[model samples]
Target: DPSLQIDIPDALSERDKVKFTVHTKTTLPTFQSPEFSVTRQHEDFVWLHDTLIETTDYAGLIIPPAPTKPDFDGPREKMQKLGEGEGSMTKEEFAKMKQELEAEYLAVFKKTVSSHEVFLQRLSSHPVLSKDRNFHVFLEYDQSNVSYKYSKVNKEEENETEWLMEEI
Candidate 1:
C-alpha cells in the first residue's frame, strides 16, 4: 500500500460551534422556485411571508398589499346567524374592514421581520463565514425531511368548503 501526506491550510486549534435556524415559505403554493431568504433579509423575508399571508405583492412589507375584494361573507353569515340583519355590509363598511385587515397583517409582518433581522444578520456574519470554525450547524435543507400537502378546489363546486391545511 502506498500512502501520501496531505497538507492542511492554516494551523488547527481550539474551535467553536454554532446553531442556526431559518424559517421561510413560498408564494402561491406552486413548486415554483422560491429564492433563498434575504434579498433585504429583514425587508425581503418579512415581505415574502407578509405578501403570501397578506398576496402577490411586496415592498417595505410594512405596507400591506392592495386589498382584494373582501369576502367578509363568512363574518357576515356569522353575524346574521346571531340575529343581525342579513349582514349585507355596505360598500363603506367593507372598505373599512378591508383596511383594518391590511393593517393587522402589516403590523404582524413588521414585528416578525424586525425581530429576526438583527439576530439573523449577526449569525450570518459572525466568526467570518468564509473561515473554518470549530463547530457549525448549518441547518441543512433535507430533502427527505421535507414534504408538501395541498389540494385544488373544484371551481365547479363553489359552494363546497375546502381545507388548505391538509398536512400529515
Candidate 2:
C-alpha cells in the first residue's frame, strides 16, 4: 500500500481549486502510450496530470500529494531513498525516516497551499463559475498495471445540474 497526495486546480477559472489527499493500497497499472493522438504531447501531459490530480475516489475521497503550484517541490530525494534504494532499509528505519520527511513535506505543502490560496483569492476575489470545463487526472503503478482514473466527474453525466455544477 502507498499513500498519495494530489492537488487539482480549477480548469475553467484559475481562481477555483481543490485538493485531495488519500491513502490506499490500490495499485493502478499502466498502459502503452496512446497510439493515436491528435493533441501535442505537452498538452496531453498537462491534461493527464490535471485529470489525475482532480479526480475523487468512489467514496468522494480526494487522494493526497494534491497538486500544488507548479513550483511545489516534493520530498523526491528522501522518498526515493526510503521507498526505492540500492539496499532495502529495515521497516523501522523506513518508517522513522518517512515520518520525519513527511512532516517536512507537509509543512512545505501547507505553505504552497497558502500561497495558492492567496493567488486565487487575488485572481477571482470571489468564486466565479463557468461551463464546459474539462479535466484529466489519473494514476498508474507501472507501464502495465491497472490504472485508476479520477476527475471532478469523468463518468457519464447523471443530470444537467450536476454536470453544470462540475463544469462550474
Candidate 3:
C-alpha cells in the first residue's frame, strides 16, 4: 500500500466557481491524522503551486505545474440563452437541450477535478515533494486561517540555475 494517497472524490459547482473536497490518507508520521479532508477552491491550488516554486530549495525540483481555472462559462451562456428562448421551442426540444447542456457542464467539471487530483498525486508520489511542509499544511489544515499569503509566506530569490523537466 502507498504511504500517501490523495483523491478528489467530491466537488460542488456554484455558478462559475468550483469547490473541491480533497480527501487525503497517509501513514507518514509527519501528518497529524491518518485520514482527513479539506475543502479547496482553485485559488488554493494556485497558492500551493506558487509556494513550491517560490521556495529556493525547490528551485532544483521540477514542481508540478498548476492546473488552469475551471471553465463553465460557455455552458452557462448556452443555458441562459436556452432559458430566454424557452417558450419558442417545444417541451421535448427544450428538455433535450437542457439535459445535453447539463451533461456538457458535468464533463468539464469532471476534467477540472481530475486535473487538480493529478497535481496532488504527482506531488505526493515524489519523494522530495511529499516531504514539503507546505504540502502537509495543505492536506491537513482547514481554512480556519484567514489567508494563506499571511499564514505561510516564505520570501526569497534567484538561483539563476537552468533546469529541464517534462510536461503534459
lDDT of 2 by residue, 28-87 (tens): 232233211121122333454455446453135332222244332356556666666526
How does model 1 fare in lDDT? 0.33
Q: Which pairs clash (backbone N, Cα, C closer than 3 Å) in model 1? A: 16-134, 16-135, 38-41, 51-55
Candidate 2 lDDT score relative to the true structure: 0.36
Q: Give lDDT tens digits, candidate 1, residues 1-168.
A: 011111111111111311123432323232223322211222333433343344323222333232121123443344344434326667677667666655654454444444544333333343332121210112123343355676666666336545554221
Which predicted model would earn the best lDDT?
A: 3
Ranking by lDDT: 3, 2, 1
Q: How big is the positional error of residue 125 in model 1, measured in Å on the Cα after superposition? A: 2.1
- The superposed Cα distance between candidate 3 and the true structure at residue 90, in angstroms, equals 1.7
Q: After superposition, how far is residue 25 of candidate 2 from its true place, in Å?
A: 34
Taking all chains together, each candidate's TM-score versus the true structure is 0.31, 0.31, 0.81
RMSD of 2: 18.1
Off by over 4 Å in 2: 1-69, 72-74, 85-88, 123-168
Worst 10 residues of 1 by lDDT: 1-10
Higher-TM-score candidate of 2 and 3? 3
True-vs-predicted CA distance for residue 78, candidate 1, Å: 14
